[PDB]
Assembly symmetry: C5
Homo-oligomer: 238 residues x 5
Amino acid sequence: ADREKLLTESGVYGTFATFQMDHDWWDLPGESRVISVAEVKGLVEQWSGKILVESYLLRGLSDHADLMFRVHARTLSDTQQFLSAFMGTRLGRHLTSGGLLHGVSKKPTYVAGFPESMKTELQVNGESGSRPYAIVIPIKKDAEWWALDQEARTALMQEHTQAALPYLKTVKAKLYHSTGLDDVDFITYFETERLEDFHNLVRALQQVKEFRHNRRFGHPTLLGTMSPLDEILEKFAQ
Amino acid sequence: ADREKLLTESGVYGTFATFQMDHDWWDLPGESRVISVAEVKGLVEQWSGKILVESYLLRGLSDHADLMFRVHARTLSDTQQFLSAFMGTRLGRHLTSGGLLHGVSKKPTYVAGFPESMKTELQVNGESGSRPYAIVIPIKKDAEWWALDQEARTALMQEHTQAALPYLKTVKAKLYHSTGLDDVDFITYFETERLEDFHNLVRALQQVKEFRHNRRFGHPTLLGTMSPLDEILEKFAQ
Amino acid sequence: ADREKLLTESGVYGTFATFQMDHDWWDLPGESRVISVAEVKGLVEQWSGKILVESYLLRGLSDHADLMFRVHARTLSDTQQFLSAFMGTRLGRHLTSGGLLHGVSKKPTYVAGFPESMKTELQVNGESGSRPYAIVIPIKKDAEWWALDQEARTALMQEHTQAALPYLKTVKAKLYHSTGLDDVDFITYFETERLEDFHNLVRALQQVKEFRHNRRFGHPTLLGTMSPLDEILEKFAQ
Amino acid sequence: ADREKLLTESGVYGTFATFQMDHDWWDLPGESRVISVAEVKGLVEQWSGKILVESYLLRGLSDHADLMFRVHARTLSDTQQFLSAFMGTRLGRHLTSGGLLHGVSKKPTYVAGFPESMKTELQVNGESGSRPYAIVIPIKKDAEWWALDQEARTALMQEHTQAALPYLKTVKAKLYHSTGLDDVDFITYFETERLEDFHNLVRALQQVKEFRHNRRFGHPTLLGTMSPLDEILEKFAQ
Amino acid sequence: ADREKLLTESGVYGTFATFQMDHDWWDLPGESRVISVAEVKGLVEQWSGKILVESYLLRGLSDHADLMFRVHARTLSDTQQFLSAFMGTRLGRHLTSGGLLHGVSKKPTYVAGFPESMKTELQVNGESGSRPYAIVIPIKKDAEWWALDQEARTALMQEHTQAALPYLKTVKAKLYHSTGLDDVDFITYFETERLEDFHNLVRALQQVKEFRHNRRFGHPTLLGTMSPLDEILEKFAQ
Ligand code: HEM
Ligand code: HEM
Ligand code: HEM
Ligand code: HEM
Ligand code: HEM
């Protein structure tokens, strides 16, 4: 059950790591490539004790990116060790590291102050399907947002949540608190089988006032398809 | 007829994919290059069932770009599969992927609220010629735009449309709704045999108020000439 | 006389194309380099029917640039074909394409509304010398500029023109209308034997109000020396 | 004891130097790599008279960076000579230099003007552990900050200090005065065993008014693990 | 004495050229590298008639840069010819050219309008030492600055000069007028034996009003050590 503990509980660090495959990877024979896929596969299993790693095919959906990992760990030391080991494998040595972002999952700041009916809706179980699309949008808030007192922010966030409620059924959302660990305040992560819903979700949110306090939004916006690592890697060994 | 259903109907995803050819492609003999063009040509025909692909020569018109595809598909899964297959062909292995943008085609938001005579003019058949120039300008709206109510935006869009009406006859326009799928809100796409008209069209639009709510406009602005894939690729195999 | 028709008449497209030579070019023997200069020389002659090409030594004057062409053509199709052919020559295959900008030459928008004495001074023949320095500054206007009515813009332009009049004799100026063909509204081009004069010219213009409506100015500012192609290329074949 | 004099005394220059390992490093045999690690190790020891160098593993924590040095020296001349020597070693020749920033340590400008109890708290010994995480955030103040008089700035800094006091015990902080030696005003450096606390510390500080006078903040924000040089380099010679 | 005429007189153009050494330079044997240093050394002496060149070790002090020349010439033609010949030497062919900026030295615009005591202090001889640190900060003024009349700017500059007077003794300053020749208005250049003083100088200047009319400041800020060309190049041939 500890797999779920990393995915839901607070205190857990989440890292998003992007990679792009070099040209000269394909100058390697398909034999050696398949051997290299085995190494990576094996390294991940070795770390299955200390961290949970999920993989996404970004190739053909996000610019300048083929692969993303989402890594859950209780210390970033562990995530560092893993990612460094990964980048050291034969396969990793032909990758170019793109972006890298960290944030901790936390007990919610505002939700207690929302009405009880809104709390009930937030508990009712949302999207949960196999091989969803996944989106990742990093966000930095403006100075104005921190200047507001708690009551003001709580009210703006209630408005946010209200706009989003109709999309709970078809879009799963997870929030990571990132300030100080890199150049952004939050990493937002989403899963959905229907991208048009996620698009409508973001359009709904562009109406709420809070959404203009986002000094940075995307850059990049990462789009991909969530899949087992073997499947993604096996595609590269052809 | 399903080819036109992808080009006109709502719900269809449109992807714009840019590529640049490596120096070392030309270090390959003209024989192997012509072989490689056959592979790509064949791959596209294999996907002719599930997607429609159109090609544009950007070399010599847009900076740092040789080729662009506009890809229509009902799911971005299919577009992903295609693009990844493409990038894997021998030809694709010597390409560097530039930008990548997605947006869904939608039933119009404001046009119902326009006067009847304007609706008639929008129906009257515009530009439709062979081997036109094509332009692509990605756009992100400012926060102020979303703060406006529906009535205010409808009025601003009627003004936009009015400015553009005289150009219907010589410029074809298509709009893709992109928010959430990448870093922009819209992808605008245009065809014309006379670039002067398109330039005059944009100047006319720079007068309307709405046009200042474009927090981002171009970067890149892509200019090319639309042509059959064999013609473009054949040029690279010389 | 048609050479002058391309340089002065309206409707003519002007393209500015920058290039930088790769390190590995020099790894080629001086024999092959001279052969390659012949090929380029020959290609230009073959296009002398449909376009006019002029060349500028940017090496040592503009950062990250060795060569610039200014190409006049009546369609960008023809400019595309040429530049693509050029980039295909053995010499072109060792070049890295820098920036690329287009604009059409047009009948003047404001000059009719100026006083008659100012019209006469604008007619009086300015600088025209061999092997001048050449400068190219791209410009994008701010939203405020388009919000102004014609009367306001004509008055601001009369002020611009007034500031510039004393420099007509030692600086030649040409303006290209670029909006919609790339990320800028204008391409400005100048020739002078005395760079201090051009520097004073720009200083004089930084006083006029209109000059603060330039949301983008330069980036890059291109400086070079105008010369026959054979002389530039010959220098690289040593 | 002079090691501590460099780390705490005023007048001492501090340099932060980032590096990333090239792909072709791994194309060298493990033999030669181990040789190369010996050379660097030896160079550092030769400079142990004139400078103190500390090392941080950025690989897997900061994007596009594997290694950082923090170098203390009494002249930047010495730091120059060392870094240039380092970049010349065989290992250094397969590195790509990322960012580089300098600042001098100074006697505090505002702390004398704080209340006595706050001064006592600042003296009380904070975090001091082995192999901490390290963070580095470069900062540039806005024009408004310098326009304030000394009294206004003292008051805003007292507020900053207050917000940060609870974190003294679990976060060590060091400030370098950087204006004029590069494009920023300050380099901030931190050590902590608990990244959660650092994150909370930055959140607490986002409430104070002074924190909005930071025209630039991060870009990059550097995150790593502090460790002996032999251990980091050893990792690369596998 | 004409060496000093280029360094002090008006009308003289000054060019700042930055370079970085390729990895593959060190793949050349130490024999060939020392031969290459001879070539460059000789080329400089051949141009000793027409231009004065001074060299600076940027490696280890400025990011992404190893070498800088400051070149004084009466025409930029001569600077262009030199730099191009330089970049063509075997040594220059393994260099990557970084930034490049030009500006003319001019008779002062405001100093006549200052009080007489301030004029006397400006005459009293400042810093002049061997092998100083050198700093170069490019500056672009904001639109507001040019909107001001001459009296306003003279007053703002007197305030600048007053803030700076105490540093005349330990910092030498030189100003180049750059508008129109590249993307900035001024190139500022400084020599000092004590970097702490220069830092304090810039801090003192950050309090004057004029200093917030700098729309761009640095990017880059170049820091190095001034030395004979032999010594710098010799270091690279080891
Ligand atoms: C799927 C529907 C969504 C729901 C139900 C939802 C709900 C919430 C809730 C309840 C919070 C408050 C967390 C707390 O109390 O600590 C929150 C925060 C946040 N949400 Fe969403 N959200 C949704 C979609 C989105 C989207 C699409 C984005 C942006 C792409 C987004 C961006 C954020 C950000 C940046 C915060 C943190 C703001 C802050 O605490 O200062 N959310 N969301
Ligand atoms: C060729 C003639 C043109 C016509 C007839 C036209 C017409 C329209 C119409 C009717 C809409 C509203 C669609 C809806 O109801 O959702 C629209 C939207 C839009 N148009 Fe155009 N347009 C033209 C050219 C352009 C050009 C040149 C651009 C920009 C390069 C442009 C940019 C946009 C954008 C960004 C929107 C989305 C507005 C929004 O919903 O915020 N149009 N256009
Ligand atoms: C020889 C000195 C110059 C003269 C005589 C001159 C004259 C003019 C005139 C008459 C126009 C308006 C043309 C029309 O009515 O369509 C114009 C437009 C323009 N000029 Fe100049 N100019 C000079 C130098 C410059 C310089 C140095 C720059 C900037 C580097 C510049 C930037 C522009 C721009 C961007 C426009 C287009 C403005 C608009 O139409 O919205 N000019 N110039
Ligand atoms: C417990 C941790 C911290 C403490 C105890 C602390 C305390 C202080 C104190 C006392 C000063 C004044 C130095 C003087 O008077 O000359 C100062 C300056 C400064 N601190 Fe902190 N701070 C802490 C954390 C941070 C953090 C997390 C940041 C930013 C990420 C930061 C940014 C700065 C900056 C930029 C200055 C210079 C302000 C100026 O002189 O304009 N500090 N800090
Ligand atoms: C020894 C210290 C300095 C002294 C004595 C000094 C003095 C002066 C003087 C007298 C002028 C006006 C000359 C004229 O009439 O054109 C001037 C201009 C200027 N100085 Fe300084 N300066 C010093 C340091 C600096 C520094 C550190 C910077 C920036 C890093 C700087 C930036 C400028 C700029 C951009 C101008 C041109 C202002 C304009 O004409 O718009 N100066 N300086």
